[PDB]
Design a protein around this ligand. Structure first.
Ligand SMILES: Nc1nc(=O)n([C@@H]2CS[C@H](COP(=O)(O)OP(=O)(O)OP(=O)(O)O)O2)cc1F
Ligand SMILES: [Mg+2]
Lengths: 544, 392
DNA sequence: GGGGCGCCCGAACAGGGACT
DNA sequence: GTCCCTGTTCGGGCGCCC
């Protein structure tokens, strides 16, 4: 039936007009289901028969759930005004509190219970192969979701006012209703809620009225003291395509919310060169191995718990290598609220302290969404490793309240640049130059002990020659070395202490830095005739 | 009362900025404040057919169990059509006159651009959207439309106290006097009383941070190399800086820890440069049609340095901000509030900040430490570690 | 066909440094 | 100015919910 709620006024974008698009041919299985649906809707006021005074038309079709009627308004959606979406995210079971009594209700034929603006009905014209227009929200129009969600909220607002301590999780037409009443009195409230919805035209079919645990909700099963995800099944192909791995990436990601340990780096690295979805791809050993690891952790049984506002939130992070991080959030040990992974690579060059600081940031934001507060952290990093980093590093960086957890692999800084120049260490003056024309270059050094080397490079860049020279000085020096450079580019990278990089060359440099006992890197302004930055400049620029 | 028409700059839409996640605290406070504002008719509920949005949050002022709603209107302000003695005073008190604005209605056809959205914990519900019916706190237009009404209110107090400077910046009234602190406070209370019947800073203790060169009885090649790079940079700000003699000590290819005795020339050149750094920066004129730009460098140990300029190397001001369990982001957040305050007092305008912090770090936590009623523009940078040595 | 959030990727900017 | 390298956004695809 149809809500007496006020319609929501809606326009086309300025200077535009409704869709005029031919209905494409359609199998009869569908045509039968269409007219079945349309004769009832038309009977009920939800659609009206139009004439030839309606120029517009938009294709319609169906897919099976019973049947769902759809309309390909891709063209109308283009001409319609913008909406601010009111759905800001997805409720998560781990943010639910323990409730004495629980109900889950679905609203029956939701969209078709909300009236569409009169001045806009004409644009919704569609034709069954009979012509109709919509008097209610259509499935396929881009305005239907927000208009539904907002209307629902107006409709629930009075009930929520009158019943501040009944919690109603409202996800489109889905209602989870929780109370601290005994089932008798809870059921009385539910009935009050259902008559409230019915007054506004929204039915709640007993068919989808769940009264006993486990409740089915948002892809989960909610038991009274625990929650679980509904079964996940990974493809078992032998030949894999882009679109197949994506199905696997996606499903793993979804699992990672409650299955600790999941990893998807190598699988993801596969999807890089591809230009189209059909390509098949060799499951590299690195990736094929990952698959099995994940595939193994899924077989084990798993569950989260609910939220007790009167205890603390604790997030505990673990390192998995290759810039991969896993975490678990809990209030009581081995009773997870939920889990997750972090795996984003930010920057050409980074180290494990930065990545850990990014995982903390992510987890903090996610926790604020779900529980409205920050967790306390448990991290594989020494209170003193952190302070070293926080001291030397030039950026503001910070981690909220945390204690160390010696669960390796511990996060560590892999080398430290000296603060003062090194006595009894040979001084290298390095430099590089490149030619923008020919792409030819040179990198070399000159040392206070009389050593001098110049290496010619091909297909290079100025910045590269500059890193090449530093690398060269690292290669030909003892376990202690002073290096003087005039490159802000190179000094900037090395001073931030990366342990991993997208650049092979920086990786090679990193390996050298870890080998060394002591490195002091110092900067001077170029072309100011500083010796013997000046002397190595002549060398590497000659012929360049 | 009847409303004043207001437009956007031509060829500009309203703001469409996504609401960020709030803590339980801030949401509870916001829902309290909003329901009351909706009773008093100051805001109305709206739908998703209004396509505009602007972030809201809330700050717990002082220790007081009173929250203040805070709408980030920076975007809308960018898109809204368009007191020298105050920096001298012994004391300036900052008053929050924001709620005065709620008494003036707001052009109906403009209200839609003031839309905002209250999130829920764990997305229990979709957002609740409101728009303003009155002059909103934080909006550029609010002090404009209200000025004539603000003048009428103040004019008598200004008469009776001509030594007192009152300056307004959006929600803020800056009140400056040379009174000893007891009679100052009494006067402030006096101005508060006057405001009621309608409906602590110390500017001349603001020091600047000069570039300064180390003093040493013996200099290594490294020392001199640092020195010359620093001087060579500084020469971009003080073109009289000279580096020729000192640089000539680094002829050859020498060990970093080799000791170099300074020549007579080099000592003189160093002595000149020392003096040149005293002599104030020449030729820097504040241009109000240009952005104020602020850079901050982290010096460590609770030390922060900053410069305000509009053109590269043309500094209007340069400063330092000083403070175990230190919180960098807090410190940074406090530093930008301090700098903004100075900048308003000195020029009545808010600088665009270049923040030495990663975006996500900053965006994760800065609302935890914010106490101002305004919010400055900002952008995030990767400080080349060179410049952090320059203001050492 | 629609809206939401998530994840990964690469395209198109926007900066600042080094160079003819 | 140009190239280079780095950052950010924003629109692809897939997952999941209705
Ligand atoms: N793929 C979907 N597209 C949609 O536009 N919807 C929208 C948002 S929720 C609304 C549900 O409409 P209906 O209530 O007729 O859906 P239903 O048949 O699942 O539920 P019911 O049997 O009517 O109680 O349809 C749902 C989808 F799953
Ligand atoms: Mg339904």
């Amino acid at each position: 039936p149809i809500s007496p709620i006020e319609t929501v006024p809606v326009k086309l974008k300025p200077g535009m007009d409704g869709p005029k698009v031919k209905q494409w041919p359609l199998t009869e299985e569908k045509i039968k289901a269409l007219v079945e649906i349309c004769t009832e809707m038309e009977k009920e006021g939800k659609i009206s028969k139009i004439g030839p005074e309606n120029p517009y038309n938009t294709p319609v079709f169906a897919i099976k759930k019973k049947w769902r009627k759809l309309v390909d308004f891709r063209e109308l959606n283009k001409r319609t005004q913008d909406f601010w979406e009111v759905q800001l995210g997805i409720p998560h079971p781990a943010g639910l509190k323990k409730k004495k009594s629980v109900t889950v209700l679905d609203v029956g034929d939701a969209y078709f219970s909300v009236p569409l603006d009169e001045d806009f009905r004409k644009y919704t014209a569609f034709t069954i192969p009979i012509r109709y227009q919509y008097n209610v929200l259509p499935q396929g129009w881009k305005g239907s979701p927000a208009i539904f969600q907002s209307s629902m909220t107006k409709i629930l607002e009075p009930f929520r006012k009158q019943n501040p301590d009944i919690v109603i999780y409202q996800y489109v037409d889905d209602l989870y209703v929780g109370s601290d009443l005994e089932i008798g009195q809870h059921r009385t409230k539910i009935e009050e809620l259902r008559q409230h919805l019915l007054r506004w035209g929204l039915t709640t079919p007993d068919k989808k009225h769940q009264k006993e645990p486990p409740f089915l909700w948002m892809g989960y099963e909610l038991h009274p003291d625990k929650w679980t995800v509904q079964p996940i099944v990974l493809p078992e192909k032998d030949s894999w395509t882009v679109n197949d791995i994506c199905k696997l990436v996606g499903k793993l990601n979804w699992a990672s919310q409650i299955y600790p340990g999941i990893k998807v780096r190598q699988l993801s690295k596969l999807l890089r060169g591809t230009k189209a979805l059909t390509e098949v791809i060799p499951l590299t050993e690195e990736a094929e191995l990952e698959l099995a690891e994940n595939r193994e952790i899924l077989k084990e049984p798993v569950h989260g718990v609910y939220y007790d506002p009167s205890k603390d939130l604790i997030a505990e992070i673990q390192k998995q290598g290759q810039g991969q991080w896993t975490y678990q959030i809990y209030q009581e040990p081995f009773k997870n609220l939920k889990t997750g992974k972090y795996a984003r690579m930010r920057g050409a060059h980074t180290n494990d302290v930065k990545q850990l600081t990014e995982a903390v940031q992510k987890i903090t934001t996610e926790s604020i969404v779900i529980w409205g507060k920050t967790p306390k952290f448990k991290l594989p990093i020494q209170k003193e490793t952190w302070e070293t980093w926080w001291t030397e590093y030039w950026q503001a960086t910070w981690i909220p309240e945390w204690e160390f957890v010696n669960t390796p692999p511990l996060v560590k800084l892999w080398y430290q640049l000296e603060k003062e120049p090194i006595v009894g260490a040979e001084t290298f003056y390095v430099d590089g130059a490149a030619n923008r024309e020919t792409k030819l270059g040179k990198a070399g050094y000159v040392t206070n002990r009389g050593r001098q080397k110049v290496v010619t490079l091909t297909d290079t860049t100025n910045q590269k020659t500059e890193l090449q020279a530093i690398y060269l000085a690292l290669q030909d020096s003892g376990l202690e070395v002073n290096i003087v450079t005039d490159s802000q580019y190179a000094l900037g990278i090395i001073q931030a202490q990366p342990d991993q990089s997208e650049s092979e060359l920086v990786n090679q440099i990193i390996e050298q830095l870890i080998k060394k006992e002591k490195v002091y890197l110092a900067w001077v302004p170029a072309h100011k005739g500083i010796g013997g930055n000046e002397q190595v400049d002549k060398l590497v620029s000659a012929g360049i | 009362i009847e409303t004043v028409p207001v437009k956007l700059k031509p060829g500009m839409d309203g703001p469409k900025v996504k609401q960020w996640p709030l803590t339980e605290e801030k949401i509870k406070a916001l829902v309290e404040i909003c329901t009351e504002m909706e009773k008093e008719g100051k805001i109305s509920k709206i739908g998703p057919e209004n396509p505009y949005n602007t972030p809201v949050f809330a700050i717990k002022k002082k220790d007081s169990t009173k929250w203040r709603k805070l709408v980030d209107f920076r975007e809308l302000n960018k898109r809204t059509q368009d007191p020298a003695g105050l920096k001298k005073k012994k004391s300036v008190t900052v008053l929050d006159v924001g709620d005065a604005y709620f008494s003036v209605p707001l052009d109906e056809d403009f209200r839609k651009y003031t839309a905002f959205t209250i999130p829920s914990i764990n997305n229990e519900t979709p957002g609740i959207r409101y728009q303003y019916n009155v002059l909103p706190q934080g909006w550029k237009g609010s002090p404009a439309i209200f000025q004539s009404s603000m003048t009428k209110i103040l004019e008598p107090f200004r008469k009776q106290n001509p030594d007192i400077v009152i300056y307004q910046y959006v929600d803020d009234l800056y009140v400056g006097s040379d009174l000893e602190i007891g009679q100052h406070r009494t006067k402030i209370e006096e101005l508060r009383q006057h405001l009621l019947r309608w409906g602590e800073l110390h500017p001349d203790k603001w020091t600047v941070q000069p570039i300064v060169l180390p003093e040493k009885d013996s200099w290594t090649v490294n020392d001199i190399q640092k020195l010359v790079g620093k001087l060579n940079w500084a020469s971009q700000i003080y073109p009289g800086i000279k580096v020729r003699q000192l640089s000539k000590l680094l002829r050859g290819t020498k060990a970093l820890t080799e000791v170099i005795p300074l020549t007579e020339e080099a000592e003189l050149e160093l002595a000149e440069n020392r003096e040149i750094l005293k002599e104030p920066v020449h030729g820097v004129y504040y241009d109000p049609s240009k952005d104020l730009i602020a850079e901050i460098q982290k010096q460590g140990q609770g030390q922060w340095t900053y410069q305000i300029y509009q053109e590269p190397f043309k500094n209007l001001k340069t400063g330092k901000y000083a403070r175990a369990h230190t919180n960098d982001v807090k410190q940074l957040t406090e530093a930008v509030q301090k700098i903004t305050t100075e900048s308003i007092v000195i020029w009545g305008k808010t600088p665009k900040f270049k923040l030495p912090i990663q975006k996500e770090t900053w965006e994760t936590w800065w609302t935890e430490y914010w106490q101002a009623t305004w919010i400055p523009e900002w952008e995030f940078v990767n400080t080349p570690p060179l410049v952090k040595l320059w203001y050492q």
